[PDB]
């Protein structure tokens, strides 16, 4: 019931979850940011990003919190 638009986001969201839970957790996040950034330190910043995103109460990013974090 939806054409191109938010699906692309799913593409990323897919590569995000290396396993299969449709949920990017600090562990999965770091792995994600690592593939793009890599090297360097600062882990608190990672969780900080997942903490200020929105977390309706799961302290984690989901296709929803992920869609709002990607947009500008």
Cα separations (Å) of 32 from 1, 4, 22, 35?
29, 24, 14, 5
Taking CB under 5 A as the criterion, the residue among 14, 55, 68, 70 binding Ca ion is 55
Residue closer to Ca ion by CB (options 31, 54) is: 54
Q: How far apart are CA 45 and CA 28, in angstroms?
A: 14
Here the tokens at position 47 are 């969780």
- By beta-carbon proximity to Ca ion, the closer residue of 34 and 51 is 51
- Contact segment (CB under 5 A) with Ca ion among 4-12, 20-28, 34-42, 51-59 equals 51-59
The contact set with Ca ion (CB under 5 A) reads 54-56, 65
């Amino acid at each position: 019931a939806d054409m191109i638009g938010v699906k692309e986001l799913r593409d990323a969201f897919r590569e995000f979850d290396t396993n299969g839970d449709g949920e990017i957790s600090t562990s999965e996040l770091r792995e994600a940011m690592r593939k793009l950034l890599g090297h360097q330190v600062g882990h608190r910043d990672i969780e900080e990003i997942i903490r200020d995103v929105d977390l309706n109460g799961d302290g984690r990013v989901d296709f929803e919190e992920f869609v709002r974090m990607m947009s500008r």
